[PDB]
Structure formats: C-alpha cells, structure tokens
C-alpha cells in the first residue's frame, strides 16, 4: 500500500511594497531541501508558491487554498498519508475576541476557521503538519488542542542583537490595503474581501454567522473522533514572529531557522512535541521573545515529525 507525502510551501516577501519581508522565500527553499533529503518527499509532490516578481504561481489566497485543496482529496482513509504545509509571511488578527489569519500576497485573508475546515476534510490516520512562521500564528487551526503554549507550559534573556522585522501586520494596515483595491471605505473587512474575491474569500466572510455556527457544530462533532491537524506556530496568538536579517539574500525567519537547527543537531526521528520544545529552547537562548506553540491531539504530540522512522 503506497503512502503519499505531499507538500505545499508558501513564502511571501511582498517585494517592492510597504510590507516587505526578506527571509520568507529562503525559509521555503530551506524547508523544501529538508523534506526532499531527510523526509523522502518527491519533487512532483511539492507545490511552491512564492511571490518573487518573476514567479509563475503567486501565493494568492485562491492559489494557496487551491494547493491545500489538491492535497486534500488525495489523502485516502487508512493509508496514513503525510501532508505538509509551510507558510512564511505576514500574519494578522481580525475581530471580545480576535481571529488569527495569514496574509497572502493579494491580502485574500485565510483565517483560523479556514484551516479548521481544511483539517476536517481529512480522513482518520492521515496527518496535516502545518508550520506557520508568521505573526499571530498561534491558534491558526481553530479548536486544535494546545499541547505547548501559554496554557500548557509553566530569568530574562537579553534581547537578540540581530536585525529583526515583524511578520505581523496591524488590522488597520490590512484594511487600508483592501481599501486601496476596492475604493470603498468601511470598517467591515469582510465587505472588502467579498467584493474583491467573491466565492474565493475566506469562509468566515462568505457565510452568515449562524450558517457558520451550524457548520462549526458539525466539525465539533467530528473532532471528537478524528483529529488530524498538527500546527507548529512561530509565536503565540498575541505575539509576532521575527524576520531576521536584511535584503542581502541571507535573511531568514527566526522560527524556521530554529527548526532547521534542531533538525541539524538531531538526525534521529523526533516527536512533534520534542521539536517544538527544542525550537523554543533555541529562540529563548538566542534572545528572541516569540514563543513557538504546538497544537495537535495527544496521540500526534507523541508521534514523530513527518512520520520519520
């Protein structure tokens, strides 16, 4: 029985804009080399969506969700397929409570209910490992149980001397960017997103609130018996993630680089909980104040990262 190893790698540098980053595409290329070498992924099973000017497939909201949607609908029940999704780019929070989201290059926001809907499309036994090196990345898979974070873990280190830039955009910056495209002025971000993207907008913005409630009740019932999502966030829900370096071609994400360092120092198979904890140790010692978090079931917290033997 053939097992599939599929990957979608997304990197947004937003070049030549007001929200430029410099290490996100390098994060994608480094993670692509890691899964090709160490974890047995094949070139034909990896989709890369980066926003360099000459890119042929840009990481728009529709293109990202379509790529994740092609990984869905290939996972088979009882096959234990291995799905992987890496995101390096800007994140944001949108409104008593706030939702977490990533910011595609066209600002077609993908929120935490979108990823909760995604993991509920997967059969039991399959794994969806998501590494989101972005601001406010904690909780990007809504209702996924926090295994490592502010509610599951118990001297101050001097702040890093590296040159860093935040991978989080304020809500006003996202709203103003969408206003520059629509030409309308309203405080409802869903109105801009529905106008711009229509059926390709986020699930939160297409469904009326009570219709979304009925949909979430079906997921709550399914999550009591199937739990396939594994989220490794670069920071907490109330934090940002650091983009390290300048535009010299050597920039990187602090969390993505910490993951690569832990893998370089531990060649054997590593549990999902162990990888996040050691990545937290790396960033804490290096003076970074972001706290990577882990969200998955108890069984997947004890499973090896990407099912390495």
Swiss-Prot record:
Family annotation (SUPFAM superfamilies): Caspase-like
Site entry (Cleavage), positions: 167-168
Residues of the site described as S-nitrosylation-insensitive cysteine: 24
One GO MF term attached to the UniProt entry: cysteine-type endopeptidase activity
Tissue specificity note: Expressed in root tips, cauline leaves, flowers and siliques.
Any single GO BP term: proteolysis
EC number: 3.4.22.-
Residue positions the entry lists as glycosylated: 161
Modified residues (S-nitrosocysteine): 135
Active-site residues, record numbering mapped to chain: 90, 135
Keyword annotations from UniProtKB, A to Z: Apoplast, Autocatalytic cleavage, Glycoprotein, Hydrolase, Protease, S-nitrosylation, Secreted, Thiol protease
Annotated Gene Ontology cellular component terms: apoplast
InterPro entries: Caspase-like_dom_sf (IPR029030), Metacaspase (IPR050452), Pept_C14_caspase (IPR011600)
Description of activity control: Inhibited by serpin ZX and nitric oxide through cysteine nitrosylation.
Result of changing residue 24 to A: Reduced proteolytic activity
Localization: Secreted, Extracellular space, Apoplast
Hydrolase listed as a keyword: yes
Post-translational events: The two subunits are derived from the precursor sequence by an autocatalytic mechanism.
UniProt family annotation: Belongs to the peptidase C14B family.
Function recorded in the entry: Cysteine protease that cleaves specifically after arginine or lysine residues. Does not cleave caspase-specific substrates. Required for proteolytic processing of GRI.
Protein name: Metacaspase-9
Organism encoding this protein: Arabidopsis thaliana
Gene behind the chain: AMC9
């Amino acid at each position: 029985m053939v097992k599939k190893r599929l990957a979608v790698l997304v990197g947004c540098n937003y070049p030549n804009t007001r929200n430029e980053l410099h290490g996100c595409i390098n994060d994608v290329l480094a993670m692509k080399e890691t899964i090709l070498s160490r974890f047995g992924f094949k070139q034909d099973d990896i989709e890369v969506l980066t926003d360099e000017p000459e890119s042929k497939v840009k990481p728009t909201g529709a293109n990202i969700k379509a790529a994740l949607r092609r990984m869905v609908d290939k996972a088979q029940a009882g096959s234990g397929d291995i799905l992987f999704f890496h995101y390096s780019g800007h994140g944001t929070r949108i409104p008593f409570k706030q939702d977490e989201a990533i910011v595609p290059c066209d600002f077609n926001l993908i929120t935490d209910v979108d990823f909760r809907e995604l993991v509920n499309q997967l059969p039991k036994g399959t794994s969806f490992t998501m590494i989101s090196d972005s601001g406010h990345s904690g909780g990007l898979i809504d209702k996924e149980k926090e295994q490592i974070g502010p509610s599951s873990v118990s001297p101050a280190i001097e702040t890093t001397n590296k040159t860093i830039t935040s991978r989080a955009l304020p809500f006003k910056a996202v709203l103003d960017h969408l206003s520059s495209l629509t030409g309308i002025t309203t405080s409802d971000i869903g109105t801009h997103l529905l106008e711009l993207f229509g059926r390709d907008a986020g699930l939160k913005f297409r469904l009326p609130a009570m219709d979304l409630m009925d949909l979430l009740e079906t997921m709550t019932a399914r999550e009591k018996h199937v739990d396939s999502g594994i989220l490794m966030s670069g920071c907490q829900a109330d934090e940002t993630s650091a983009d390290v370096g300048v535009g010299n071609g050597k920039a990187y994400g602090a969390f993505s680089n910490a993951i690569q360092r832990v893998l370089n120092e531990n060649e054997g198979a590593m549990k999902n909980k162990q990888l996040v904890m050691m990545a937290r140790d790396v960033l804490e010692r290096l003076g970074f104040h972001q706290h990577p978090c882990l969200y998955c079931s108890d069984q997947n917290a004890d499973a090896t990262f990407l099912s390495q033997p």
